[PDB]
Enzyme design. Sequence first.
Site, short mmCIF file in Angstrom:
data_model
loop_
_atom_site.label_atom_id
_atom_site.label_comp_id
_atom_site.label_asym_id
_atom_site.label_seq_id
_atom_site.Cartn_x
_atom_site.Cartn_y
_atom_site.Cartn_z
N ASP A 181 0.80 -1.22 0.00
CA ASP A 181 0.00 0.00 0.00
C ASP A 181 0.86 1.30 0.00
O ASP A 181 0.53 2.27 -0.67
CB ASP A 181 -1.01 -0.04 1.17
CG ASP A 181 -2.37 -0.76 0.80
OD1 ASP A 181 -2.61 -1.15 -0.39
OD2 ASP A 181 -3.20 -0.93 1.72
N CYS A 215 -1.03 0.28 -13.85
CA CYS A 215 -1.18 0.32 -12.43
C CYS A 215 -2.40 1.21 -12.29
O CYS A 215 -3.32 1.08 -13.09
CB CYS A 215 0.10 0.82 -11.78
SG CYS A 215 0.87 2.33 -12.47
N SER A 216 -2.49 2.09 -11.31
CA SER A 216 -3.66 2.98 -11.31
C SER A 216 -3.55 4.14 -12.35
O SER A 216 -4.42 4.28 -13.14
CB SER A 216 -3.95 3.54 -9.90
OG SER A 216 -5.20 4.21 -9.95
N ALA A 217 -2.49 4.96 -12.29
CA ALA A 217 -2.26 6.06 -13.25
C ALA A 217 -1.45 5.61 -14.48
O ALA A 217 -1.43 6.31 -15.48
CB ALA A 217 -1.57 7.23 -12.59
N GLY A 218 -0.80 4.46 -14.41
CA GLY A 218 -0.07 3.98 -15.62
C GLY A 218 1.32 4.61 -15.78
O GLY A 218 1.87 4.65 -16.88
N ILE A 219 1.88 5.17 -14.71
CA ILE A 219 3.19 5.83 -14.81
C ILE A 219 4.24 5.39 -13.74
O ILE A 219 5.42 5.33 -14.06
CB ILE A 219 3.06 7.37 -14.87
CG1 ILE A 219 2.37 7.92 -13.63
CG2 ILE A 219 2.32 7.78 -16.16
CD1 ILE A 219 2.31 9.43 -13.61
N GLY A 220 3.81 5.06 -12.52
CA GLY A 220 4.71 4.76 -11.41
C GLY A 220 5.20 3.34 -11.38
O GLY A 220 6.31 3.03 -11.89
N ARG A 221 4.37 2.46 -10.84
CA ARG A 221 4.75 1.04 -10.82
C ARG A 221 4.91 0.51 -12.23
O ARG A 221 5.77 -0.31 -12.48
CB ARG A 221 3.73 0.21 -10.08
CG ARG A 221 3.45 0.69 -8.65
CD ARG A 221 2.32 -0.15 -8.04
NE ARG A 221 1.81 0.53 -6.87
CZ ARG A 221 0.67 0.26 -6.24
NH1 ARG A 221 -0.13 -0.69 -6.67
NH2 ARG A 221 0.31 0.97 -5.17
N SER A 222 4.11 1.03 -13.16
CA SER A 222 4.16 0.55 -14.57
C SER A 222 5.50 0.92 -15.18
O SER A 222 6.05 0.22 -15.99
CB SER A 222 3.05 1.18 -15.42
OG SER A 222 1.77 0.99 -14.87
N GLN A 262 7.56 7.73 -10.28
CA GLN A 262 6.88 8.84 -9.66
C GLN A 262 7.40 9.26 -8.31
O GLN A 262 6.93 10.25 -7.80
CB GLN A 262 5.39 8.55 -9.56
CG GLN A 262 4.64 8.84 -10.89
CD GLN A 262 4.56 10.36 -11.16
OE1 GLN A 262 3.79 11.07 -10.45
NE2 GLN A 262 5.40 10.88 -12.09
#
Length: 287
Positions: A181, A215-222, A262
């Site tokens: 989380d 991922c949620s926004a498509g930039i961090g974990r992705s 991010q």
Amino acid sequence: MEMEKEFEQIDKSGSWAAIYQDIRHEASDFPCRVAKLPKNKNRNRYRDVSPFDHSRIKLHQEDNDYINASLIKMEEAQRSYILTQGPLPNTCGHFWEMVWEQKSRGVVMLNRVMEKGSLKCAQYWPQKEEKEMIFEDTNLKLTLISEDIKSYYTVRQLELENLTTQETREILHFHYTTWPDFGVPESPASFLNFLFKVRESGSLSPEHGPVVVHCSAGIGRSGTFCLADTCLLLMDKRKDPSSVDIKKVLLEMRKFRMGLIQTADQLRFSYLAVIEGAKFIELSHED
Ligand SMILES: CCc1cc(C)n(-c2ccc(N)cc2)n1
């Protein structure tokens, strides 16, 4: 300069934030006009996360071709990726339409639908074999064929059918289920095992369309997944593995979608993952 040694210097200096902010200042800025049209307001999860016009995925439909998704083309690594936000309740049909049109074989998911008590992502695939999903707007049917739950990740076999032609295709859904989380995984071991599974499945092969990652926004974990995978590909390709600079690879991917990686933590984790990935190729009750 082993990546190893640079890591140790950055960690000793406490300079992850400073390196990350340097990367932010040097990053490309391209327009996102299409994403900002009034009619696309409800197709973006976040107002500040937009695909650039030059690298956005177009839906091959007529009324509105817009989806928050970017084609990352890594030319020297010879691999491509689509990075997209987590589907919204109204954009699930458009997600699967993209999968269909781009001929993707795999979808990689790096978040849970629900995190910190907020919806990060619509339930855009069927949880039960017997309750298929029909996307009426894009004329697609989606069925859960099977699922293999392991301790850090789940692989599902999905069948996607074009109800217009009755063509069907098998899609592999690779879901990393244990990103914390808050912050990043303390070890990149499970993330790397995940990544080699996706590679082993053939979904990243050139006989398929680009893999779809979100991922949620498509930039961090992705961003961590694609950065890690491309760096690893580049090391193997080049005669020299110590000549891959993860900073310059990241900047290269940031030409195709804003904001990839991010946080300074995510940057550190991606270093770790590449270092441990390249190499591969205590009693407590705190709670
Ligand atoms: C120039 C960038 C490039 C070159 C190739 C062969 N691909 C590629 C695309 C999709 C997949 N799954 C694998 C590779 N992407």
